[PDB]
Amino acid sequence: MEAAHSKSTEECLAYFGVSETTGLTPDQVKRHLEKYGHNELPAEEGKSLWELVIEQFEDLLVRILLLAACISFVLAWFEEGEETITAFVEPFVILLILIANAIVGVWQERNAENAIEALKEYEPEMGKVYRADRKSVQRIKARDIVPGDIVEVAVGDKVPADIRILSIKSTTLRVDQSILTGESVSVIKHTEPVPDPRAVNQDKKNMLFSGTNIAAGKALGIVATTGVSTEIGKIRDQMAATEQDKTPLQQKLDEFGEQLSKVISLICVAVWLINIGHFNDPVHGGSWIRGAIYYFKIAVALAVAAIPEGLPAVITTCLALGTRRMAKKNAIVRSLPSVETLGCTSVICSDKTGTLTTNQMSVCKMFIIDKVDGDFCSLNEFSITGSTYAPEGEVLKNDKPIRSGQFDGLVELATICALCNDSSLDFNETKGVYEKVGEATETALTTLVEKMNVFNTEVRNLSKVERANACNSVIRQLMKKEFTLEFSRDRKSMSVYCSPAKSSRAAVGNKMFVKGAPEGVIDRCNYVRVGTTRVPMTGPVKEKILSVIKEWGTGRDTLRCLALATRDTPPKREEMVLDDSSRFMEYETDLTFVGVVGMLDPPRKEVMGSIQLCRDAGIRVIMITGDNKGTAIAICRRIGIFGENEEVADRAYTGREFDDLPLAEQREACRRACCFARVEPSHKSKIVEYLQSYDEITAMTGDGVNDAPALKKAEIGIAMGSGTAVAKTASEMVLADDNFSTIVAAVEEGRAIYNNMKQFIRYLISSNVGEVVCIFLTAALGLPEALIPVQLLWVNLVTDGLPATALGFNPPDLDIMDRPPRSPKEPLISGWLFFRYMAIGGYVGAATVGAAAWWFMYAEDGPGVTYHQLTHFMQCTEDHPHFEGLDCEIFEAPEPMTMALSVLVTIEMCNALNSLSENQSLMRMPPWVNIWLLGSICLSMSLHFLILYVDPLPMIFKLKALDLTQWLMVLKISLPVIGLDEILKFIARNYLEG
Amino acid sequence: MEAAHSKSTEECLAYFGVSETTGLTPDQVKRHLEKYGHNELPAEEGKSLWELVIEQFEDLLVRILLLAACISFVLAWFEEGEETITAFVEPFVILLILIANAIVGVWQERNAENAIEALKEYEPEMGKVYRADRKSVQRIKARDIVPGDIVEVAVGDKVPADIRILSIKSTTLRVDQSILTGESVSVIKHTEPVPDPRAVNQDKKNMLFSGTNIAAGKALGIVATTGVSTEIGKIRDQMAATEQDKTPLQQKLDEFGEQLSKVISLICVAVWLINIGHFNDPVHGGSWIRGAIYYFKIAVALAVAAIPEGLPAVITTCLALGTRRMAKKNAIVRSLPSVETLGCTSVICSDKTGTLTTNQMSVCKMFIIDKVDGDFCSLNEFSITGSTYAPEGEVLKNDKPIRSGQFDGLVELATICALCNDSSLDFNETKGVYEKVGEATETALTTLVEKMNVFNTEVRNLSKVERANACNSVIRQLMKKEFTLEFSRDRKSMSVYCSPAKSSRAAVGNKMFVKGAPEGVIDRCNYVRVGTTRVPMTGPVKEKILSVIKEWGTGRDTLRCLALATRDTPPKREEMVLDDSSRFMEYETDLTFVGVVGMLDPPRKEVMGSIQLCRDAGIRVIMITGDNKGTAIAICRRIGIFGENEEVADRAYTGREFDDLPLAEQREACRRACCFARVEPSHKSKIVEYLQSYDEITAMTGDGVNDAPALKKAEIGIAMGSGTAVAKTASEMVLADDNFSTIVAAVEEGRAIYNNMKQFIRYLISSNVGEVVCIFLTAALGLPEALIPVQLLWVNLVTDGLPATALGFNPPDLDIMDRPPRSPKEPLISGWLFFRYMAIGGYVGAATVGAAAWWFMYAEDGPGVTYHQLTHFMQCTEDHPHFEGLDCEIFEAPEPMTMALSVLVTIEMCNALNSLSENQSLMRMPPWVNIWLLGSICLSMSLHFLILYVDPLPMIFKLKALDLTQWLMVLKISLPVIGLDEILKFIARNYLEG
Ligand SMILES: Nc1ncnc2c1ncn2[C@@H]1O[C@H](COP(=O)(O)OP(=O)(O)CP(=O)(O)O)[C@@H](O)[C@H]1O
Ligand SMILES: [Ca+2]
Ligand SMILES: [Ca+2]
Ligand SMILES: [Ca+2]
Ligand SMILES: [Ca+2]
Ligand SMILES: [Mg+2]
Ligand SMILES: [Mg+2]
């Protein structure tokens, strides 16, 4: 099909030869599948094959080093004779460390996307359609939909393909197509054709586009185009871009990155200044131009050696790692930030029905009026069996099976349940079980009437597929549904207008069948039905009705109740304006009470514990629901939000009560109350907002469209896998598994990701500081050069490389989930931390000069012995008195440097073992806890010993192998770094906190 | 200059304005240096920058794998859907192992060349020239030579630059220019000009080319062109190629390489056959075309996994390593083969003077006749002091200084020493010491006459440079040297024809001054001089002369003696034909004995011990010399070839005696005698040849041109750094240091290089055999596939990679130099070794299937348990009776394979620790003896664990991580391999040999 919007409903039906009531024929479906293919887009597998790489080279930090590489390379072509080699290496020593991370990053990034792309591929999308195959609407894989068969869609649904609306089954049909037309607000639809054949999507008010969601109403329509031919299948990634952005934790880490950049840039040009008097030295001999370039090169080298190059990548790796960890737990992270944000979560507002509960409804109790004797009132309670949606169960009166049809009140009760109901039931031949089609609460009523079989219909001689709606169909034949006043949360009810079909009930007139929240309906009832008679509603009757609702509500089964009534004398079909659902409550008045039903909706098993763990991590869990406060509190006690016998008269409200409080008190009640009932979708959001006026990190968990607002308002929205699409769209994460627990685990990961980020910045700084206080302490005490360009670049590639990145793989502390959430305002780096940095950064920098000196001084069997004369080292050229006579060129020996460069590397590797935690002992948290860290160290070490024992290298690096004794001197001066930190930890642990 | 050959001697002198007697002026030299630069070629530093790499890819073996990579890559583009990844990896897994060696090889190769190129650069070449600067010929760095100054050259010398012969100072001047004209035989030169301006080098019989050596005679000439303008400086590597060849050990290893290639190629196509019935299996499902390609791929995989790819490189690395080790000991290896060959050395024929001794001559004793009273004869012995060439010492008679000039006989003795002498003395201002110019024996005589000062010449008022030849010059003024009958080893003497200058001695006639080996000269003496008188030679006089020669000869000082005589009435200058030196002995007849001189030439200090160590290694050391048998045996006792009081009457010969023996006895005496004296250069070679008729590996060590033949004939020639160029040219190695010991060390290295080669072939085969007996034992017992293509290629890259190459770095056994040399005929692989191979190769191959089965069977907490049912594994598809019911697809689990592939890798690494020796216990020779091997293992292991724990990998490699318990199962079945070999070693060690 094409330009389907231009033609009319008949033309479209005509064009495909289909009855909008029957649907395609199994044969037609077979053919169309061949003529149009499956309703699916080309597998958009993990792309960005090369882009990912180039992405690694974007941050400022990596740019700098990437620039230094060019400089070091230009100076290479301008370096002559005897050391051109040691010049062409420097750049590659910078380029390498950079490339080593570009891979770990692009690799982690790859695995992430895949795991996620694989979790989506899991549970296939379904669609509701009408086909000759069956009389009732059936479910099917969305990919099997073909242009032609009749499709049904309702509030909350994801439009499966481009549909030409044929009929609107409600007063209004609003749609959310921002994903296409870009317009945020939900647009209204109609069936009227749009004549302009070249009209824009925003003008086709009689079309529904694949990918958009139904914001309101219900509608039936004919599929115009599917697969790639869809309005959105064309604007696909293959023919349209997308969008990106940087996480908040990253916004704070880039602000910190540059902050370091500036500092580093200063303490570097400072070196170039504190050495202007050396441009004219024998070591250079050449002009001040040749002597400057050297110290200039040392500056850049110190820069590179200081810049935390792996920060921009370690963050990407931790995030990707988080994403991947969630996927392994069946959680789709629609936004990287999510994981981090969930760590600072203090409050988690969760929806009840469908979220904290399973939303597998089943009417197991119900009653109608028996006798009304003035002051005395009796009810006719019943019990129904069968917990699933299967139409297999018995109606019991006093524990004994009875013919529901026997009771008049029960016949009406079923008439209402069947008629004022927008859902249905469909048997899944494959799984061999009846699945619902529509809302569980409504479907529960559908199976109910199937069980009651009030008109004693032959059901034994029927198939699984036919037994599903049989009884229901029968009742649909007795009355004609003129129209329905769709359910709306302000009214808390739904209605349906009916006219008698034949002349059996014709002598009675039109009727309106209502059902909604007990409180609302029972109040708009002036009559209570008794059998087939009617009597006025009285105090005593109202009394009985509610008391039993209360009983069932807060009972052991915490039943979700629904009232049913009828408008014996509805308004004149004309006097009613379906313009706005606000006028409907009036039409549902002067009603006659019929009966009540109670269904069970078991809370999810994993929820109780999750709430406990949430408590341990000092995270609050508030329940928000449209349901009854009684049953709402009941379930709260059942899941652990409330103690079995805890007084909650002050920690539980109903939107009514809440609104009754003055503004200031509402806000206040939000940080006190843990349960809100009979609350509207605007109240959910508001509650979340109040919780945010206290600068807290709020999470929202829901499944319905009445959770859309809240899920958006929150910092992080988590939606149920089996929930509406409209809820998923407004969520940062999706529990495909529907496992509530995963939310907890998502917080731990968020907490660990932050911790690792710290341990990394802690390592890189407490180490790189020594690499500076080593260059200045020497230019202060007067000692000779301790390191050269290539030398620095090397310590960098070995201390700021993989060993640092592997820090992003550090396990969470043994108590990361037993400490309250971190304030969103808490500073990235605490004062005590900066101390930790200078404390270590100072020792390591001094532990290096003390090594270069040690050789010169206390060198036992070590050559070149002397004492304190090092300060005046360029003076043996003219004035060498005390000088024993040892070559006046011993102040340029590789022995000293190579003796320090090793302590440096070595001590830094030791410092890495201190980054396995922040306050935990290296004895409580063994170094072997992060195998990836060890392997990173061993590799780093090996890579160093290699630079010392492979003939060509030691020369290029102006180094000289160390004695099997001099090394022990390093393991002597470096190893103690563990203690300095181990002790500081004991302080922040036992002294400060704890 | 140019076309210098076309012009005459005068024209050439004219062209540069130089006197062939004076030489260039310090000023002229300064200018010419600027106008022509230094006599040197462009620094031909280590080249072959890229060629070295491509060289790694030449051998057959690496070619094969290089082919498999192409195949595996072609099949990659033709593999579809679900495992294209596991297909594109295979090739890179082959390419990697190849590249990993190409580097270790090209790297080792690089270091080698450099070390050598650096050892050559060490001691600068010198040249003999005449310059106004000084009256006597002086020494100078050859690079300072400029076209123009007069240069001198003599037998043994290396021509410093392109010289235009000006004057031949001998009857003949033969030159060796093969290096240029290519003609092997030594060509005769002349002074006659060659008119053809475009003549070829082979026609310029009046030129000497830089780079060639003087085969005979002496000559003075003018430098025509130097530096790059030389006839050889043009044909340089930059404008001309070179040559190569493969070592014998390599010729035997390539014969063995292909031998394996054929076998491997068979046991591979065999696999492809023993699996034709599987091309039609469910595992493939596809046609026999799809099923074949698989088993075809497994074949190639087994091939690659079997081929010893690192053999062609490990050999190159050991050799290069040898070369490098020798350089570190100041030994220039002019041929890689050398080091290996020196290991099989059984006999080392070494020259005495200059080789076993220092050749720093100094006349410290001398005598002339005192009185001849018929039957009584007395001598006038003297003693001279001063061991160096400095003209500082005293002549003592009865321990008291005397005026040599006092004795007439001593005046003649000095006349002769000064006149019949081709060498001179030159003072080196820099080193501040007198250096010889010419042969040490002759120069010894030069310093001698300086000491005697027979004409009492004012020497006190002279400079160091002038004091050098003063007295000598004076005597040169008394007689005119008409011509000289150059020394020739058949005669064992030298002669000079002189005429009186003025009319002081004119009333006597012409004279001939002879000096040579005592035996020869004394026999051609009919008169003995007494003072200025002459008396006939008698028995008694002959008796005294020789007895004292004997005394001095075999004395504590083992003095090298020389006789001096004169021909009072020489033949008529015309009656003499200088055509051939064979006619000279006649001219030196009817002589008058004058006196004898004895010089000391101290044996090198390091020689004695070296001979001992040579003995321990069961290597013989024979001394060959032209010198006197008495003093020859004397020195032999002194250095250890002979015991202080050992009877050698049967182990010492003189070329005369030797020739007296019948052929069969000469040959025999060669394997018995350890000392040959008064032997000619033809005898040296012959001796070496006889030693080779016994299929032994003979080494020749020399310094003179009389060693050229022998050094060539031998298997390996070793020349002294301070020896002639003609000797160096005919040598495979050069002891720049002159350290005799290095020869010993060169043998150890030769022995170790072979050993390592064995340990490598031993490892690669005893291991790769398991990788075959693992594939067949499974296709025999019926068990399921144990490995796949990518799986094999992996075991290869990790067991046949660096861990194998590092085997070329294995230290020598603790007794490699205490075992006799290996027979040249000994088979590369002994029978007992092939056993060792199958013994291990079998267990490892069976220890793999027993692991893949173990999981399937005795798997404790390990899943997929069963019993013996494995044989019938493709039958649960139709007939599964006893089958407990466990999935009929458990026979395709990764658990089993990944459980074996680990044992394989693991057990092979353990096998590497068995290759640290052949018979020594892993307890005597710790595994940590070869750090390079350990590091290779750790890397290999790490690289494996990585393929198991990095999510993407285990999938690509169809593997699945092992339990922290299943691994212990590997360390249980693999670790015992150490014992199998440890025990076999105990056998070949204690049982077999030992
Ligand atoms: N289709 C329908 N027709 C009539 N009444 C309905 C209805 N669906 C729900 N209701 C009633 O209206 C009250 C509120 O609906 P609302 O959607 O706000 O809350 P909820 O109880 O359905 C789900 P949650 O627990 O997720 O908030 C319900 O609790 C129920 O009693
Ligand atoms: Ca850095
Ligand atoms: Ca660092
Ligand atoms: Ca191999
Ligand atoms: Ca192997
Ligand atoms: Mg809900
Ligand atoms: Mg000699």
Residue A625, annotated as binding a ligand: yes
Extract the tokens encoding A549.
Answer: 């609702």
Instruction: Please return the burial class of B609, using the count of CB atoms within 10 Å of its CB with bins 0-12, 13-18 and 19+.
Output: middle
Residue ranges of A 198-237 with Cβ closer than 8 A to chain B: none
Mutate to test the pocket of ligand 1, among A448, A487, A701, A705 (most ligand atoms within 8 A of CB): A487
Mark whether A503 and A528 lie in a shared domain: yes
Least Cα distance to B22 among B166, B186, B193, B208 occurs for B166
Spatial contact of A544 and A530, defined as CB atoms under 8 Å apart: no
Distance CA(B388)–CA(A22), nearest Å, equals 126
In the block, tokens 């194998």 appear at: B804
CA of B971 to the centre of ligand 2 (A): 41
How is A757-810 classified by DSSP, letter by letter? HHHHHHHHHHHHTTTTTTHHHHHHH-------HHHHHHHHHHHSSHHHHGGGGP
For the record, the structure tokens of B492 come out as 């064992």
Residue whose C-alpha is closest to residue B304's, from B68, B58, B63: B68
Instruction: Look up residue B541 and give its two tokens.
Output: 């006089």
Contacts of A851 (CB under 8 A, 6+ apart): A899, A900, A903, A969, A970, A973
Whether A607 and A736 map to the same domain: the answer is yes
Beta carbons of B424 and B469 less than 8 angstroms apart = yes
Residues of B in contact with A107 (CB under 8 A): 952
Of B910, B914, B907, the closest CA to residue B810 belongs to B914
Residue located via tokens 């056998």: B987
The CA B304 to ligand 5 mean position distance, Å, reads 10
DSSP label of B458:
-
Question: Bridge-partner residues for A436, per DSSP?
Answer: A425
Same domain, A485 and A612: no
Q: Which residue intervals of A46-142 are DSSP H helices? A: 51-56, 60-77, 85-120
Contact status, residue B49 vs residue B110, Cβ threshold 8 Å: no
Distance between CA atoms of B373 and B541, rounded to whole angstroms? 9
Strands A218-225 and A150-154: antiparallel
Residues 6+ positions from A310 with CB-CB distance below 8 Å: A101, A760, A764, A800, A801, A804, A805
Residue where a domain stops, chosen among A745, A763, A788: A745
Say how far apart CA A486 and CA A852 lie, in whole Å: 84
- In eight-state DSSP terms, residue B276 is G
B85 touches chain A (CB under 8 A): no
In one-letter notation, the amino acid at residue A824 is P
Round to whole Å and give the CA distance between B528 and B536: 6
Q: What is the DSSP letter of B74?
A: H
**Is residue B500 located within the same domain as residue B626?**
no
What is the spatial distance between Cα A763 and Cα A915, in angstroms, rounded to a whole number?
A: 6
C-alpha to C-alpha distance for B509 and B482, rounded to whole angstroms = 13
Identify whether residues A762 and A708 lie together within a single domain.
no
What is the maximal distance between C-alpha atoms in chain B?
A: 133
Q: Does B111 touch chain A (CB under 8 A)?
A: yes
Chain A residues within 8 A of B951 when measuring between CB atoms: 111
A95 residue type, one letter: L
Q: A139 pairs with which residues across the strands? A: A128
Phi and psi at residue A790, in whole multiples of 5°? -50, -30
What is the C-alpha separation between A958 and A943, in angstroms, rounded?
16
Q: Which tokens in the block code for residue A107?
A: 């690799």
Q: In whole angstroms, what is the distance from residue B763 CA to residue B918 CA? A: 10
Q: What is the CATH number of the domain that holds A596?
A: 3.40.1110.10
Residue-wise burial string across B865-904, b where 16 or more C-beta atoms lie within 10 A, e elsewhere? ebeebbeebeebeeeeeeeeeeeeebbebbbbbbbbbbbb
Cβ of residue A489 lying under 6 Å from some atom of ligand 1: yes
* Residues paired with residue A564 on neighbouring β-strands, in sequence order: A515, A595
Residues of A in contact with B110 (CB under 8 A): 952
Q: Which of B107, B111, B935 sits opposite A942 (nearest CB)?
A: B935
DSSP letter string, B202-226: GG-TTEE-TT-EE-S-EEEEEEEE-
Does the Cβ of A442 fall within 6 Å of ligand 1? yes
Provide the 10 A C-beta neighbour count for residue B270: 16
DSSP state of A579: S
Pairing state between β A174-176 and A134-141: unpaired
Boundary of a domain, candidates B683, B712, B745 = B745
Count CB neighbours of B941 within 10 A: 15
Cα Rg of chain A (Å, integer): 37
A569 is in an annotated binding site: no
End-to-end CA distance of chain A: 71
User: What is the bridge-based pairing of β-strands B698-702 and B347-351?
Assistant: parallel
Partner residues linked to A483 by β-bridges = A497
| Nearest Cα to Cα of residue B68 among B408, B304, B418, B243 | B304
**CB contact (8 A) between residue B111 and residue A935:** no
d(CA A51, CA A244): 14
Judge contact between B471 and B452, C-beta under 8 A.
yes
CA-nearest residue, atom 21 of ligand 1: A627
- Assess contact for B159 and B147: CB atoms under 8 A: no
- B728 token code pair: 């160096």
With the most atoms of ligand 1 within 8 angstroms of its CB, the residue from A351, A485, A492, A678 to mutate is A492
Residues 6+ apart with CB under 8 A from A346: A618, A619, A620, A696, A697, A698, A820, A821
User: Would you state the structure tokens that stand for residue B491, as one six-digit string?
Assistant: 């005669």
Same-domain pairing of B150 and B178: yes
* Residue B275 alpha carbon to ligand 6 centre in Å: 61
Asked if A753 and A812 touch (Cβ cutoff 8 Å), the reply is no
Calpha distance A166→A191 (Å, rounded): 6
Output B858-863 pairs: Cβ under 8 A, ≥24 positions apart: B860/B965, B861/B963, B861/B965, B862/B895, B862/B963, B862/B965, B862/B966, B863/B895
Which one of B59, B254, B351, B738 is the catalytic residue? B351
Contact (Cβ atoms closer than 8 angstroms) between residue A832 and residue A918: no
Residue whose Cα lies nearest atom 15 of ligand 1: it is A626
Q: Please, are residues B193 and B147 in contact by the beta-carbon 8 Å criterion?
A: no
- Clarify whether residues B630 and B520 are in a common domain: no
Strand partners, B5: none
Q: For residues B345 and B715, what is the distance between their CA atoms, to the nearest angstrom?
A: 9
What is the B105 CA–ligand 4 centroid distance (Å)? 17
Those residues with Cβ within 8 angstroms of residue A43's Cβ, 6 or more apart along the chain or in another chain: none
Set of chain B residues whose Cβ sits within 8 Å of the Cβ of A111:
951-952
Look up the CATH number of the domain holding residue B637: 3.40.50.1000
HSE-CB at B265 with a 13 A cutoff on CA atoms is 11
Beta pairing class for A376-384 and A363-373: antiparallel
Q: Does B167 touch chain A (CB under 8 A)?
A: no
Do residues B727 and B350 lie in contact, with contact meaning Cβ atoms separated by under 8 Å? no
Residues in A 940-969 with any Cβ partner in B closer than 8 A: 942, 951-952
Burial class (CB in 10 A: 0-12, 13-18, 19+), B726: buried
CB A374 within 8 A of CB A381: no
For ligand 7, the distance from its centroid to the CA atom of residue B717, given in whole angstroms, is 14
Distance CA A820, CA A616 (A): 8
Question: Is B668 labeled as ligand-binding?
Answer: no
Ligand 1 atom 14: the closest Cα is on which residue? A626
**Rounded Cα gap, residues A755 and A608, in angstroms:** 28
Tally Cβ neighbours within 10 Å of residue A403: 13
B310 vs B62: CA distance, rounded Å: 8
Nearest CA-CA partner of A948 in A964, A933, A937, A968: A964
Distance (Å, rounded) from C-alpha B151 to C-alpha B145? Answer: 9
Burial A35-68 (b: 16+ CB within 10 A, else e): ebeebbbeeeebeeeeebeebbeebebbebbeeb
Partner B contacted by A85 (CB < 8 A): no
For residue B594, what are the domain limits?
Answer: 359-602
> Residue B725: CA atoms inside 13 Å, Cβ hemisphere, count?
22
Is A627 assigned a ligand-binding role in the annotation? yes
B534-537: which pairs have CB atoms within 8 A and are 24 or more residues apart? B534/B568, B534/B592, B535/B372, B537/B593
**Of A493, A610, A628, the residue nearest A558 (C-alpha):** A628
Do the annotations mark residue A800 as ligand-binding?
A: yes
SS (H, E, C) B654-704: EHHHHHHCCHHHHHHHHCCCCEEECCCHHHHHHHHHHHHCCCCCEEEEECC
What CATH number did the domain enclosing A126 receive?
2.70.150.10
H or E stretch including A273?
A: helix A248-273
Which residue is it, tokens 């024998």? A282
CA–CA separation, A656 and A679 (whole Å): 8
Ligand at shortest distance from the CA of B804: 5
Cβ proximity of B918 and B925 under 8 Å? no
**Beta-ladder partners of B622:** B349
Residues A755 and A898 in one domain: yes
Sign of CA dihedral B875, B881, B882, B888: positive
The DSSP code sequence of A23-47 is -B-HHHHHHHHHHH--S------S-
Nearest to B65 by CA among B19, B28, B96, B34: B96
Task: Give chain A positions within 8 Å (CB) of B112.
Answer: none
Per-residue burial over A605-638, b if 16 or more Cβ lie within 10 Å, else e, is: ebbeebbebbeebebbbbbbbbbbbbbbbbbbbb
Comparing C-alpha atoms, which of B603, B629, B602 is closest to residue B683? B629
Amino acid, single-letter form, for residue A574: E
Q: Cα–Cα distance between B623 and B635 in angstroms, integer?
A: 10
Specify the residue with its C-alpha closest to ligand 1, atom 22. Answer: A626
Whether the Cβ atoms of residue B899 and residue B972 lie closer than 8 Å to each other: no
The alpha carbon of A121 is separated from its chain's Cα centroid by a whole number of angstroms, namely 17
Cα–Cα distance, B962 to A296 (Å, whole number): 53
Nearest to A391 by CA among A356, A363, A410: A363
Match 């490189």 to its residue by tokens.
B313
Q: Answer yes or no: do B515 and B635 share one domain.
A: no
Structure tokens at B627: 């010198």
Residues of A involved in catalysis = 351
Sign, Cα dihedral of A830, A836, A842, A845: negative
Closest Cα partner for B314 from B62, B68, B63? B62
CA distance B498 to chain A (A): 58
- Closest Cα to residue B165, out of B220, B216, B227? B220
- A938 shares contact with chain B (CB less than 8 Å): yes
Q: Which of B435, B419, B336, B382 minimizes the C-alpha distance to B126?
A: B435
Final residue of a domain: which of B602, B620, B650?
B602
The closest alpha carbon to A164, from A91, A222, A87, belongs to: A222
Among residues A696, A728, A734, which one has the least CA distance to residue A715?
A696
- A456 close to A392: Cβ distance less than 8 angstroms: no
Inter-residue contact B261 to B64 (CB < 8 Å): yes
CA dist A338 and A333 (Å) reads 7
Residue of A nearest to B328 (CA): A951
Same-domain status, B477 and B328:
no
B423: its two tokens: 């060498």
B942 CB neighbours in chain A (<8 A) are 935, 938
> In what order do the strands lie in the sheet containing A652-654?
A332-333, A733-735, A716-720, A698-702, A347-351, A620-624, A675-677, A652-654
B442 annotated as ligand-binding: yes
A664 and A741 belong to one structural domain: yes
- Going by the DSSP 8-state scheme, the letter that residue B571 receives in this structure is P
Count CB pairs under 8 A between chains A and B: 12
CA distance A81 to A84: 6
- Cβ neighbourhood burial of B145 (10 Å; 0-12, 13-18, 19+): buried
Q: How many residues does chain A have?
A: 994
Residues B222 and B274 grouped into a single domain = no
CB-CB: which of A107, A935, A952 is closest to B942? A935
A856 Cα to the center of ligand 2, angstroms: 28
Based on the structure, what is the number of domains in chain A?
4
Contact A698, A692 (CB under 8 A): yes
Q: How many residues does chain B have?
A: 994
Q: How many of the other CB atoms lie within 10 Å of CB of A408?
A: 15
Number of alpha carbons in the 13 Å side-chain half-sphere of residue A29:
17
Q: Is B351 a catalytic residue?
A: yes
Ligand 1 atom having least distance to the Cα of A702: 26
